[PDB]
Write a protein that binds this ligand. Sequence first.
Ligand SMILES: Nc1ncnc2c1ncn2[C@@H]1O[C@H](COP(=O)(O)OP(=O)(O)OP(O)(O)=S)[C@@H](O)[C@H]1O
Ligand SMILES: Nc1ncnc2c1ncn2[C@@H]1O[C@H](COP(=O)(O)OP(=O)(O)OP(O)(O)=S)[C@@H](O)[C@H]1O
Ligand SMILES: Nc1ncnc2c1ncn2[C@@H]1O[C@H](COP(=O)(O)OP(=O)(O)O)[C@@H](O)[C@H]1O
Ligand SMILES: Nc1ncnc2c1ncn2[C@@H]1O[C@H](COP(=O)(O)OP(=O)(O)O)[C@@H](O)[C@H]1O
Ligand SMILES: [Mg+2]
Ligand SMILES: [Mg+2]
Lengths: 189, 580, 190, 11
Amino acid sequence: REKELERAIQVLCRRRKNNPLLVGESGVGKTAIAEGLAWRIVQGDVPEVMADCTIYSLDIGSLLAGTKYRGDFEKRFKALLKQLEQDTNSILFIDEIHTIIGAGAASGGQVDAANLIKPLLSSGKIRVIGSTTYQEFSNIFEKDRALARRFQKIDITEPSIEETVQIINGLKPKYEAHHDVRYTAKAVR
Amino acid sequence: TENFTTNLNQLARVGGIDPLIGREKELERAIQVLCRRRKNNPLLVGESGVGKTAIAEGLAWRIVQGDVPEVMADCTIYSLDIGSLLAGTKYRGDFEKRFKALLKQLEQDTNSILFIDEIHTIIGAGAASGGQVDAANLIKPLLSSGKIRVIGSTTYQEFSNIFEKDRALARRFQKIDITEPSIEETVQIINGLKPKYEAHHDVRYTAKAVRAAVELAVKYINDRHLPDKAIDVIDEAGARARLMPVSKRKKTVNVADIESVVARIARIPEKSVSQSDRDTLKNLGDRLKMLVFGQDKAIEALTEAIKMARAGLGHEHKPVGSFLFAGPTGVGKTEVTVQLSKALGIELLRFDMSEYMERHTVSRLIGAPPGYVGFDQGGLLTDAVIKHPHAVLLLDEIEKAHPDVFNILLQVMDNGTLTDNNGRKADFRNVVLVMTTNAGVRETERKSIGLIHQDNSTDAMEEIKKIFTPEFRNRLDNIIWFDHLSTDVIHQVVDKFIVELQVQLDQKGVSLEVSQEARNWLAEKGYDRAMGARPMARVIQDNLKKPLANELLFGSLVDGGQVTVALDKEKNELTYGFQS
Amino acid sequence: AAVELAVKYINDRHLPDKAIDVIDEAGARARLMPVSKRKKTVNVADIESVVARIARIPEKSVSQSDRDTLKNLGDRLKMLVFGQDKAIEALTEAIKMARAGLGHEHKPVGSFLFAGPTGVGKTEVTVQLSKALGIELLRFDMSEYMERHTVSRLIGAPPGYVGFDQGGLLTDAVIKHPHAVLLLDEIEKA
Amino acid sequence: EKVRDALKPPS
Ligand SMILES: Nc1ncnc2c1ncn2[C@@H]1O[C@H](COP(=O)(O)OP(=O)(O)OP(O)(O)=S)[C@@H](O)[C@H]1O
Ligand SMILES: Nc1ncnc2c1ncn2[C@@H]1O[C@H](COP(=O)(O)OP(=O)(O)OP(O)(O)=S)[C@@H](O)[C@H]1O
Ligand SMILES: Nc1ncnc2c1ncn2[C@@H]1O[C@H](COP(=O)(O)OP(=O)(O)O)[C@@H](O)[C@H]1O
Ligand SMILES: Nc1ncnc2c1ncn2[C@@H]1O[C@H](COP(=O)(O)OP(=O)(O)O)[C@@H](O)[C@H]1O
Ligand SMILES: [Mg+2]
Ligand SMILES: [Mg+2]
């Protein structure tokens, strides 16, 4: 996924609005690229500018569970931003980013997660990576032109019927170890 | 209070806020509003990406340099973090102390200005238990008096549906409309910001590169405003050049880099075709002739239309091409379109109009059925084109489609864009539109009843004229009339089908060679003017695939191949010999 | 004048304060201007200037700059569209009447129906008119509004929409751009 | 969802 990662690394290096977005159909490796980037960083397969970078995978459901108060959500959410602001290289990976537009802890109000991060994304204080489906991106996302502007759409499409075989070969050892079996070359194809 | 409010004037000293270039007229009204006796709270309303926050932050910047009136001098600007203010306010009154404490600071100072970005959020910031005691209801008595100055910022959408709902709060705020700057203004804006982007990326931007970023962005980057589009192109160019070459790195940013960036953002080729892809375009017509025989007029129309677009002569606001391919069956109407996409390596958008027979089905192209509350309500044609801006759009059997479908294409061919019900704009300026119809075959095949035979040559066009209104036909770049395959062309077709058969056999390890004589015999059996080249497949299937199929499953053809085919003139029947 | 003009143009407010925004804003303009530049008093000319900015409409007492463009509006259009001088005259004359102060009390600047053969400049003249006047072009393709449900979008949102965008494309467009050219292409299809 | 809370000290 060099072409996809190269475009993402370029966006992350932007002075402002350095927030990549991974738009693709379901099960096309949208979350593997983000997680894979962390794996590649550890192994030193990224540029020197991206080295010493930590990716954080925010869980929206955990952040919205147990608030039960006027400002519990904002207290914890803002605290996360302070951590990210402290670390210049820290990156936040928010899978299914269409959810933040939906009221996180707002009842009859517009103080949502998206509005809180809009100033920081525009100023380059924090870097955010988001994964969402084309349909969700077209309808849920892109309605608020403010938040859409910060994110840079990166089309993630299935590579080919043949490249998938190479992908399974790389994943075959983990699956083989789990079941203590060996997959024949003909079977994977 | 210090945590909630960020002093923008301090950031200006350290460089934290980008400089404001221009916007003198917008600022002039803002200072006039701020100097008012009552309701001196300006509201910056404009589409996202047009420097609304830049003007509020720019004012803090301009104050440091002394580029504002004396009245504005010595004033500080504070940015309110609503999340920080609401955090840890579970206890009753916590929000009130923080909000009232902030207001007391502003009223006491008499020289501070508050900048609540995204002011639509304070409507119900502190509402609890469906309470009406919110930031807006509390601040309201302090705005009409004129004790405090507040600068807002909200898009037309949020302002119209959230802020404008509260008539009282909206009155206190004076809507300062901000219109996206012109191309001439944007280049000046980039020149001011350029030194900051250059420092970040350690690169230099040429004067010509800046102009191209603005001009190209307007042309190829939609749903994004001009001062933001250009900065996006400029920022990406610095990022790509800085980290792409580990060694052999160009410090400067040439115009070609900007063209490549816009190409990636818009998923369209750049204007550097004269060097890299010159060979591909030159051989495009030749390669399509090998795949499709005859019908050269259609190939020339498609390849020439493409060449003009890449060369810079294509229509500014119309698609690369709009061609109605009408003719008999099996003449390559739907084959040249499928091969063109493969030759160019671009996605093929195929729409079968047989589905869109009725008026209500047409809505699917530009939207969803009435009251489709469920998501995924985006038009198939609009969403398909947006995903693939560079692609071939094939509308097979366009005659079958309801007349109302021709009205949809009028803006596509003439204006180059189609809008969905939601409002997303699809760009067709770079898609090749090809339509296939069998409207005139019946008229041409019709035989006259009279002593003298009639030349039914123009009858095909007359039928086409009746089915397609003049406005639709006028927009068409060219109407190509496919013609029946000649006997000489059929020989080429037989060779093509045999080649496909050889490829199929190669998968099973069988090799097939046919004699030139046998090829001619196959042509005579399958040559039908009315049915074109499709009957050739039938004879190929009956003559060759049938014996091979039986042998392939069981016989010599399981492995070894080495097949040879020949015929005897006296017998007039093909002979198949298998030697493994 | 501040009272009468505000009532006429400022329609989103109420009169006691709608007329004090002009008064208050008119005085502020004087402070910004040089001490020697009419700071002592504000005349009726300054009041109409403030209203024009608040309502984003062309101010009365058209500057000589606009006159030159207005007088040459017919000639400029005639250099990009030929054989349709009657259509250009109607558009330019209607604009002149409005600026001169003889326009309709409550009707638009001009409502026209362009009917004619293909490729005669019905849409080109309208598109070039926006560029000649330097105003936004609100082009609505009416071939997309053939269905009855799609007409509610012009003045509203789809039935049963829970979000915030409860606005109409036509109403919001004109609200954003009051001074503009509204083009309804192929309206007969709608 | 947002509800105010009134506390009480132990003594
Ligand atoms: N002088 C300027 N005029 C216009 N835009 C500018 C100027 N200087 C910078 N910008 C742009 O403005 C950006 C800062 O954000 P803004 O464009 O002000 O956001 P905004 O339009 O207020 O956003 P929302 O989401 O609509 S509140 C910069 O990064 C530039 O893209
Ligand atoms: N009178 C004219 N003078 C100059 N160019 C013209 C004229 N009429 C048409 N054109 C050109 O012809 C093309 C189409 O012009 P339009 O104004 O869209 O025609 P139209 O007759 O209004 O179209 P429809 O499809 O019938 S609504 C553009 O390239 C115009 O510049
Ligand atoms: N290049 C790849 N390398 C490894 N796994 C991949 C790759 N591409 C796709 N995958 C697999 O795709 C799956 C991820 O799907 P995902 O994008 O999370 O789906 P969804 O969009 O429905 O959430 C995992 O099984 C992951 O291993
Ligand atoms: N000139 C040709 N050369 C090669 N194959 C052809 C040619 N004409 C038709 N074919 C074959 O016939 C089919 C295309 O028929 P088409 O022209 O699309 O029919 P219709 O006009 O009824 O839609 C494909 O199988 C294609 O390979
Ligand atoms: Mg902003
Ligand atoms: Mg027209």
